Predict the structure.
Amino acid sequence: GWKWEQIKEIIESGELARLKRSRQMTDKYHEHKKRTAGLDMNQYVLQKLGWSLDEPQLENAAAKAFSSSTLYAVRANDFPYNFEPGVVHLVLWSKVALPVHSPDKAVREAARARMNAFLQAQPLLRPLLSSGHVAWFVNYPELQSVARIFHAHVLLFFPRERYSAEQVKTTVDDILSHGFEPLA
Ligand SMILES: [Zn+2]
């Protein structure tokens, strides 16, 4: 799998298609694809996250992305990409889209700045941020699924010489249980 420095270089160059699953994980992803071939996965995800129109509305319509914990959700990626041991592949879903690949440089930079501020503000990521061991990307339209719901790939690096696999499990379970904290 990709080493952390390679991951950072790929994200920086925008060559996101290079971030691929292993042959085997590609096989499993293929079988899950067979299973969901009869579904609109946008509606499925909305349903699972509690964001369907059926649900109540703790909204103000104009709420800023990440301004309230009801507006986002972090999950472990069930079919992670092929990264070196210690890299944890999470998915951050947001009810509010962030136009991070807009042709408008002002809009794109502003949307990226918001995502960055959100992740930087997270106490549960503090030592990883201090280490440069948090990265994120949003797959382009020609690469993504579930295009009606914003989601970012959030990668956390726990080097093997710094965290046992069991300590990684513990910390990630902690993050997913607590969730991320909102940002005004
Ligand atoms: Zn949640």
User: Anything to note?
Assistant: The first helix runs from residue 4 to 13.
